[model samples]
Target: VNSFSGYLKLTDNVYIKNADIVEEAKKVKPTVVVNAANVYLKHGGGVAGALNKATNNAMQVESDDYIATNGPLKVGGSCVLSGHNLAKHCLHVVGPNVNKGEDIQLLKSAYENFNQHEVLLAPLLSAGIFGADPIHSLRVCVDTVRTNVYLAVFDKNLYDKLVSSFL
Candidate 1:
């Protein structure tokens, strides 16, 4: 299980936190929700799937169109939800896959995908179903942002795993 345990204010309104991702998303009702996807728009696991469901299952159709009309997205490449069934907005970003050799650096470079919003709700990208180290990912989102980031921690064990000092 995973969750964000506490909050750390990076700025006046921006904070990194541990909370039930879905509940927090609903409670905060942020301007945009970030979802990590593959270049192919084929992501259906973890945050990706959860966001799709949150949008009333309309994200993928829009995702495929955006990918086809645009191009194969690089890591950090993103697409808008276009006022789909989600919220006012949603950003689906292409995150690096953990299976490849260059992926670690790619994911590390992927946080710049947030140049489009004032406030965002996001989870630890590729850190869950894709298995990247979440501590590093959360740090990236916090460090790279002009927008306020409300990071979702899925459960308590994960929350502790991230903030508690590593042995």
Candidate 2:
């Protein structure tokens, strides 16, 4: 149950940790889990898939319904949905796609949009197949984390990098 490693206090409310977002969500029972989703909110691989899997795939069904009712999220857009088996809610955001020539500002906006939640379980947005450099993604999150958030890093190398950067 303790799938966590390093920890660093950022501010009074913000913190960073090397841990599994899903396991941390189960432990802290955050008000919401931040799903770094695609524009379509599709439960593909990476953090989105992991969160979807942890939530028993119910997030996918809600995501589909939400997209149908509204529309697909644009880069830097977000919406709140049910977290199902995990937290009470899920904050789904679409970060900038480096493959599409999007800029870092879009990724900043994506992280900025999640400030209202009290306790957020967040991952490194757009750092995987989206092709964003992990440092850029982490920087954006660090700059915008105004509320209580557990910034979870799943990769040991990235975790060490992040910790060293802060020191």
| TM-score of every candidate relative to the true structure | 0.80, 0.89
lDDT of 2: 0.80
> lDDT per prediction?
0.68, 0.80
Per-residue alpha-carbon lDDT of candidate 2 for residues 1-167, written as tens digits (9 for 90 to 100)? 22333567766665788788888888767678888888888988888888888878788888899989998888998898887877888899888878888886788888887787766778888887778988777777777867776788888888888778763
For model 1, give the RMSD to the true fold: 4.5
Question: What lDDT, from 0 to 1, does candidate 1 have?
Answer: 0.68
Model 2 misplacement above 4 A: 1-6
Each model's Cα RMSD: 4.5, 2.9
Looking at model 2, the pairs that clash are none
